[PDB]
Design a protein around this ligand. Structure first.
Ligand SMILES: Nc1ncnc2c1ncn2[C@@H]1O[C@H](COP(=O)(O)OP(=O)(O)OP(O)(O)=S)[C@@H](O)[C@H]1O
Ligand SMILES: Nc1ncnc2c1ncn2[C@@H]1O[C@H](COP(=O)(O)OP(=O)(O)OP(O)(O)=S)[C@@H](O)[C@H]1O
Ligand SMILES: [Mg+2]
Ligand SMILES: [Mg+2]
Lengths: 657, 602, 90
């Protein structure tokens, strides 16, 4: 029966219990007598006091009786959690404590359902409980979004799949047709989970994936300095700032903006201005030479005339080739910022920085006219048709990732702050932000910009409806003050002895029963602790369906080093390196692709003697010097992964798109 | 006797046990019933709860019982680690914790296989396990390469041999015919391990060995100025940059290169340009093959560098030497192909014969040539996406210092932070972990811990390990020679293996001059005038497997192991034929021939 | 801190050689109440400025931000150019 014994001790908010006879198993399923996490019951008069085990064995015996007998290892220790009213509900806080000898009964399925269940409509199931089958874990979305959360755990505990499950659950068009989410990926491992229910922005675009663009003119002057010139400090900073300001005035002169004038134009305001013009006109001073001594006028340019009299190197501003003047009076008008300007020229050269200085549609011509404004940018980022918007930061240079995170957070927060009265603000369609690998940017003494924005969101995000969800595998590195302001926690498996303690050191409801089992939660388990739940749970997050899992398309060396070596020509590698481009010169313009690892479509061509094939995950290859007779043989053989895998797999020089 | 006792305490993640009887040193092999790190198991109903022995003795008895029984200690503390499936697999984490009074057994061979063995094809063999018989240590290869590695230990621990073993087992033509690995050998010892199976580049090549040449025009502006002049910062730097630009533009006008024109030309561009013309033109204004003729002192410095046999791997490359007209026999194609595209997988750039002052700035350069070359061709069949690369670095604690201001730190940090996408690994062989920057050691994936004597470095290792398991890390300073504790995400669980030593004759040994041998042999008068005639011009010019033959120059020629060539002068050829016909090698040469005649190694 | 002294060796405001529009009126007169800083035609540079360029830029930004209206533009204690307030601390 359920009657397991009676309480033989009490200290107000704690009690102990004795055993039942050897082990007793009930109902025949796979379970055991009250374990560490299990609950128990104590009836009193008309109501019931629920308890939770603490530890089983010599850790709960009364001191002096154990002194009397050493083998008396027959006790467990249970702690009171709450009560059930007069058939009203489970309201924490006990109104009448137990006494010695009173009953204690195991907890059955209906009582656990009453404890965990709930009549409020603002709760939702984001997983499942482990003690009993099929019990939703009613997490509170309101609190979870307006008080911030944090996913923690070692590498293999499965943080990404947990975040995927949560985000899929929140953005269901049946319940929340007007969600709004943003994600930050540091390895781009979510673009595969949300196959066709989100937007993905990348540094290197794809067939049907947009391009990430952050036009440089949306930044503040200070962040622009940080990301372009590496933080100038001398009078170069002042010269640069004045140049930016004057260019923005020139832009506003020929374009009409509503309510912005020379009496209200500040540097940090987001108005278009030319960067190529900035560099050209700043640098021209550093090397200007006037045809006549004692003069500093542009008309005096001492250009080395050519055979026809026209200068050999006229130069050009839109492209970044600067001209050459006659040897030398050199004009003493420019400052001493030659090195920063050379660095800026180099930055402009790189195709790795195109997302800043050559945005696809937000690039600005010489006079400042821009094809599109920022409203479309914001509409794509946050006002799109689909809820979840995903940023792929894998391809960005590793030295400006922190600044980029800061810039994006600042833009989102400021845009949603000033329009908090319109139906597009944060108080009408609340917003959520997710951060991947938060231990490398929120360090205790990080000097970057990301921590400032994250602190601001964590501290003021409750009023303007901006939430946060931190993901990190090294809690001991996250700043303690920030980590303590997260309302909810999903403590997963935690291995090393330092992060476990640092997590215990910032958890409000430190609960003896469940926090001791932290280091051996299975792959998927998550102890959710905080205000988002009435009482701490131990939930197995419901896995997402296959195909909708997070994955990163990193190379597999064992499957690549095994393929028999194919003779390579390194003229191509040197050509690519020198040209500074990742696209070969022998790709065909395009090829019609027809539907059928696997192969989902095979092309062909006769003129160029080229074949093009597509695989899973949008992997497109082009093989060369393959007679189309082999094409028809492959089509006829009905192999689709064997004839290709056995005949032309390692016999022809190929190239990815 | 699969039985120990009954769990008496259960803290969820720290169970305790009460051993029942007598400890027997099983003969034949030596495996005792239970050790400090030995695994334990607990059948619960139908599944198995496995654990590791955490503490043994009086440190495991429940606390207050010490008051009960002050001098009674028979308890153990086991930390439960994972669990076995229902004939499915071993996975970590526990579906259901044990209670008091259960049964606790000992790990048996089938359980050894279940826990340690696996079926994934990635895993390979890198030495069997310690404290048990015939269990190969399986290390995931994909994760080890793409998630970066490290080696740590004491001076005599034997990390060079472990690295040699791993490289030998990771490049065999049987399974990995297209492998690719690079080693920045410094002390110069690996080169003896792979006699005829790897490429080795030195500064003073032998008869059957290559010459390391790094053309001075494959460098960027900052790197080149750093190497040559030390990093000028005045107007002289501007003058030199402009001169380099002018030379490159001139050569491009002289010769054509694929898709480069005046509009897309920069200093960083790797194209040929003559150093000698640069020097001669920049010096004439202040006053070729031979170096007879406000940046004067820089130009005397560079002039001294030009005619210096030490710097023969930069300015006098074997065939990358550039004519006056920017014309070279070969382009960078051959260089890249040899370094990374050769027919041999592993290549060794032993940098022992380098001016230590520049060694750091040299390492970085190579790491920048490779990465930058394997990044812009990541879609071709010759990039890192199609045949990934692994880089090795020996004695990393000198260059990766927490506060070091060199360039190597930048390159290594970049490979660690951004090598995942493009398939680039890293292997840091080190000796003093606390020196290495704590931000980089926390991004290395797997760790091969070894013996560590200092208490100030063990603490660093313990504090910077992903899975700070204590049953296997309370024994750091007592491991054997080659006994390695593998901890990381490249293995399913912590391992305590012994690395199968490489067979005799295939091992690393830097050929140091054995003082005993060179001081025991009898003194022989020296020809110091030869020393002077050899120094003025600044130039260098047991077993026996062959003997040279010549009867016209009155000379003898012998060859020892390791490719040592000895020429003995003023030897009458009668004694030559006497020795040849004697058929007494190692004894007659020992008899009256070791220290009788002059000899000069070549 | 940002001024132009027309006369070298002199820094008095009379030497304020600010660029003036060809119309006759100054291009940017500027106003105290607004935070618009007057511009001046290129040149000498006034010698009475300290190194507080950046701090004053920060203060200008704060004054132009409405989020601080409670502090720098108090509703009824706002101070004119002459140091006046409608209501004391009483
Ligand atoms: N519900 C799950 N059940 C079993 N395995 C899971 C589950 N979720 C994730 N995984 C495992 O983890 C793999 C995917 O990588 P994850 O471990 O989930 O990401 P993560 O390592 O936690 O995040 P990072 O890489 O530290 S940022 C999956 O292929 C599984 O092996
Ligand atoms: N697994 C091993 N088992 C037995 N002896 C080994 C083993 N590994 C290395 N040694 C021997 O121990 C001595 C030193 O080992 P080495 O690895 O060759 O030198 P090392 O000191 O570890 O390299 P450095 O100087 O620290 S970079 C040598 O006599 C080795 O033959
Ligand atoms: Mg992840
Ligand atoms: Mg060594």
């Amino acid at each position: 029966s359920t009657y397991i014994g009676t309480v033989q001790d009490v200290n107000g908010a704690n009690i102990r219990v004795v055993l039942d006879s050897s082990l007793k198993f009930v109902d025949g399923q796979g379970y055991r007598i009250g374990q560490i996490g299990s609950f128990v019951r104590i009836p009193i008069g008309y109501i019931n006091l629920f308890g939770i085990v603490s530890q089983v064995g010599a850790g709960a015996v009364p001191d002096k009786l154990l002194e009397v007998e050493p083998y008396g290892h027959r006790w467990i220790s249970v702690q009171l959690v709450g009560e059930e009213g007069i058939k009203k509900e489970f309201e924490r806080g006990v109104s009448q404590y137990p006494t010695i000898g009173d009953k204690v009964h195991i907890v059955t399925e209906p009582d656990l359902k009453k404890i965990y269940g709930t009549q409020n409509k603002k709760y939702i199931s984001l997983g499942n409980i482990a003690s009993v089958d099929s019990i939703p874990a009613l997490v509170n979305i309101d609190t979870l979004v307006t008080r911030h959360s944090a996913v923690l755990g070692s590498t293999g505990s499965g943080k990404s799949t947990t975040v995927t499950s949560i985000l899929q659950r929140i953005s269901d068009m049946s319940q929340f047709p007007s969600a709004r989410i943003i994600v930050f990926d540091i390895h781009g491992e979510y673009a595969a989970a949300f196959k066709g229910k989100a937007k993905v922005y990348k540094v290197t675009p794809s067939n049907n994936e947009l391009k990430l663009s952050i036009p440089y003119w949306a930044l503040t002057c200070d962040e622009f300095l940080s990301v372009a010139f590496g933080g100038l400090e001398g009078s170069g900073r002042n010269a640069l700032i004045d140049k930016i300001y004057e260019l923005k005035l020139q832009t506003l002169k020929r374009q009409e903006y509503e309510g912005i004038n020379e009496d209200s134009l500040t540097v940090d305001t987001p108005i278009p201005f030319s960067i190529h013009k900035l560099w050209f006109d700043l640098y021209r001073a550093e090397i200007s030479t006037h045809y006549v001594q004692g003069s500093h006028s542009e008309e005096n340019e001492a250009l080395l005339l050519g055979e026809d009299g026209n200068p050999v190197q006229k130069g050009d501003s839109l492209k970044v080739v600067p001209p050459i003047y006659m040897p030398h009076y050199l004009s003493n008008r420019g400052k001493n910022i030659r090195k920063p300007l050379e660095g800026l020229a180099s930055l402009l050269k790189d195709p790795r920085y195109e997302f800043l200085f050559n945005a696809d549609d937000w690039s600005v011509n010489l006079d400042g006219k821009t094809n599109k404004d920022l409203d479309a940018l914001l509409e794509t980022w946050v006002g799109s048709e689909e809820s979840i918007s995903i940023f792929d930061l894998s391809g960005m240079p590793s030295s400006i990732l922190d600044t980029l995170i800061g810039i994006l957070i600042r833009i989102l927060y400021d845009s949603l702050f000033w329009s908090r009265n319109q139906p597009e603000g944060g108080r009408e369609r609340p917003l959520l932000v997710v951060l991947e690998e938060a231990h490398t940017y929120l360090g205790k003494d990080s000097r970057g910009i990301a921590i400032d924005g994250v602190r601001k969101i964590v501290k003021e995000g409750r009023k303007y409806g901006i939430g946060m969800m931190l993901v990190s595998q090294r809690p001991s590195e996250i700043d303690s003050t920030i980590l303590s302001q997260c309302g909810t926690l999903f403590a997963l498996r935690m291995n090393n002895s330092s992060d476990r303690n640092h997590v215990l050191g910032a958890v409000s409801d430190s609960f003896e029963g469940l926090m001791g089992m932290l280091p051996t939660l299975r792959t998927g388990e998550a102890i959710i602790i905080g205000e988002s739940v009435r009482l701490p749970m131990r939930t197995i997050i419901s896995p997402p369906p296959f195909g909708r899992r997070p994955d990163s398309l990193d190379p597999d060396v064992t499957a690549k080093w095994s393929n028999n070596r194919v003779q390579g020509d390194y003229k191509e590698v040197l050509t690519l390196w020198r040209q500074k481009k990742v696209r070969s010169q022998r790709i065909v313009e395009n090829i019609k692709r027809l539907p059928v690892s696997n192969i989902l479509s095979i092309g062909y061509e006769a003129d160029s003697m080229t074949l093009e094939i597509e695989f899973n995950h949008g992997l497109v290859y082009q093989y060369y010097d393959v007679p189309e007779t082999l094409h028809t043989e492959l089509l006829a053989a009905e192999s689709h992964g064997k004839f290709f895998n056995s005949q032309i797999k390692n016999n022809y020089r190929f190239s990815r798109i």
